[PDB]
Design a protein around this ligand. Structure first.
Ligand SMILES: O=c1[nH]cnc2c1ncn2[C@@H]1O[C@H](COP(=O)(O)O)[C@@H](O)[C@H]1O
Ligand SMILES: O=c1[nH]cnc2c1ncn2[C@@H]1O[C@H](COP(=O)(O)O)[C@@H](O)[C@H]1O
Ligand SMILES: [Mg+2]
Ligand SMILES: [Mg+2]
Lengths: 217, 216
């Protein structure tokens, strides 16, 4: 079954989740009970969409035929630092429960700042793991740049939260765990100067906290 | 109450944890049951060691006094990519359960990709790591991070520790698990990035270390 987290308020009037007060929160999008089931349900959504596929063999590269998605040629996951590292670590653990083998590497953007260590993505099935898509501009360009220089057999994006109301361009992620309002959310990887990243639930931040920590780290 | 994972064997004779098979594995160092409570026992061990402390005030830096570790002057976590991103993802969520304010940045070494945190001088900083075996890697980093930033404290928390493979003198102040002197896999440990997303720490079968040689 599902043991969901209760959302209420304290005597001070702060948003609480199972007793712990959250003065930063204005609303609660999804709690860890709701967030986590969006993943084991999508881990199978990803498992159903990648397990029959066949891409370029690299175990025995002296092979002109496409090998399936095995441990010898696993699906390539590119996680977008710094926000999706919690979302990814929970995700790839779920993909193992569903039996889809994968290998993960990271990318830091603001347009590459820190770069992949993977080299053979040509003719492969690749999967970007991002925390959220708001305007769409960050992931619209990132898949252009990956698809351009690497030319994979497939490059689709999987994000946890998706607010389709803030889109300046056309970016529609192929796999979405949660759809949130057009608001700035904090928690489960979402930050305000790296604060509130380690909160287990995704809350809508009180606008009064917008620039609460202006000092550079 | 702790619900431990049962560890049996296959019909083929491979390591089985919760009915799932692991032919990669020779034994089980610790399963998710024991690994996870180990971190909730360190998240408070880390909490008690950092909550009533102070360091440089970069929030109200127009003043001179020392400030306690709050959401405005938090603990600086240095997470060493790549095989460490899961241990530091599960722990900082336990740190918040113990009310310890934190901020995390990622370093990648052999340094390859650098930090982006800059004001670490006079701060309380925390390294979270894969594992300590020889000690060369985590002693060089302490000799590095100390020299570059000169923090008020630089302490290393590691999930697993093998004191038998030590080549130099490294002693991590915070350890979750002590393992034998051999190669581990599962939960962030790898052979060429495989088995990294498994939720249990196994000791690798030596016949599997060269199983997948091709570069990614
Ligand atoms: O609602 C959110 N909460 C916290 N950060 C966000 C949110 N939406 C977008 N971001 C951040 O802003 C960046 C810009 O993404 P974009 O708006 O899709 O171009 C993202 O990569 C996130 O780092
Ligand atoms: O047994 C292991 N399994 C997987 N990776 C390991 C193991 N032992 C060491 N490593 C990696 O190799 C590095 C060497 O560090 P050192 O042995 O402490 O000097 C570690 O920081 C890990 O990234
Ligand atoms: Mg970010
Ligand atoms: Mg590594």
């Amino acid at each position: 079954p599902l043991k969901p987290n209760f959302v209420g308020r304290d005597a001070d009037g702060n948003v609480t989740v199972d007793g712990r007060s959250y003065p930063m929160a204005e609303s609660v999008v999804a709690t860890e009970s709701t967030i986590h089931r969006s993943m084991k349900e999508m881990a199978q959504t990803l498992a159903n969409a990648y397990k029959t596929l066949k891409h370029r063999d690299t175990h025995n590269k002296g092979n002109s035929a496409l090998a399936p998605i095995t441990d010898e040629n696993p699906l390539i996951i590119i996680s977008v630092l710094k926000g999706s590292y919690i979302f990814t670590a929970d995700m790839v653990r779920y993909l193992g429960d569903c039996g889809l083998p994968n290998v993960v590497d990271f990318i830091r953007i603001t347009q590459v700042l820190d770069n992949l260590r993977f080299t053979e993505l040509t003719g492969k099935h690749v999967l970007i793991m991002e925390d959220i898509a708001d305007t769409g501009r960050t992931m619209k360009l990132l898949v252009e740049k990956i698809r351009r220089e690497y030319r994979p057999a497939s490059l689709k994006v999987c994000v946890l939260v998706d607010k389709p109301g803030g889109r300046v361009v056309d970016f529609k992620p192929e796999f979405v765990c949660l759809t949130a309002p057009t608001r700035y959310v904090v928690g489960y990887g979402f930050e305000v100067n790296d604060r509130y990243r380690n909160y287990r639930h995704v809350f809508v931040l009180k606008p009064e906290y917008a620039k609460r920590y202006p000092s550079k780290l």
